[PDB]
Design a protein around this ligand. Structure first.
Ligand SMILES: Nc1nc2c(ncn2[C@@H]2O[C@H](COP(=O)(O)OP(=O)(O)O)[C@@H](O)[C@H]2O)c(=O)[nH]1
Ligand SMILES: [Co+2]
Length: 169
């Protein structure tokens, strides 16, 4: 019966890799508050309590701006965790993800916990990004890495749980 720590966590990745779907699937299976948004609904926020911990995430998600632009300094500000998502059936989304990571590390504090999500791992029959290639990049850059499926829920909870485990207290 002690102190809840709150951490801002931001979603990053090309349009259409499933960032929003991941947030929603995760949220669906945890205690959470009603979704909110910022002015003009430029960014969508949702608060969620991770089961059997005293970790509360304030998860930030975009409203699609990724397909046109970089993301604003406001989006990054305060983030203590990130999930950078790519689509395992799209090499391009993987190459791009590497750049979201660099952009992230440059904009965020040195102790941010970054997880790399190889999403749509349920389309294994259309895999275009090899697991060990992502894992090697992830290891070389101190990133947590898992393959996920927002659709089937595979590893959705556990990538959030993995992050929580690396966060302070
Ligand atoms: N098969 C499959 N489709 C997914 C998965 N995650 C997202 N999608 C689909 O990919 C499309 C784009 O998803 P969205 O969450 O909007 O991606 P975002 O633009 O990066 O937030 C939608 O049609 C989703 O239902 C997944 O894990 N598996
Ligand atoms: Co989205």
């Amino acid at each position: 019966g002690n102190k809840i720590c709150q951490f801002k966590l931001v979603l990053l990745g090309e349009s259409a890799v499933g960032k929003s779907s991941l947030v929603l699937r995760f949220v669906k299976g945890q205690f959470h508050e009603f979704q909110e948004s910022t002015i003009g609904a430029a960014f969508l926020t949702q608060t969620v309590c991770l089961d059997d911990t005293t970790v509360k995430f304030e998860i930030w998600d975009t409203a699609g701006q990724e397909r046109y632009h970089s993301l604003a300094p406001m989006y990054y500000r305060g983030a203590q965790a990130a999930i950078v998502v790519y689509d395992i059936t799209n090499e391009e989304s993987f190459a791009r993800a590497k750049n979201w990571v660099k952009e992230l590390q440059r904009q965020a504090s040195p102790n941010i916990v970054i997880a790399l999500s190889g999403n749509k791992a349920d389309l294994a029959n259309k895999r275009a990004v090899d697991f060990q290639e992502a894992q090697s990049y992830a290891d070389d850059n101190s990133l947590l890495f898992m393959e996920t499926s927002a659709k089937t829920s595979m590893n959705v909870n556990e990538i959030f749980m993995a992050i929580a485990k690396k966060l302070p207290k």
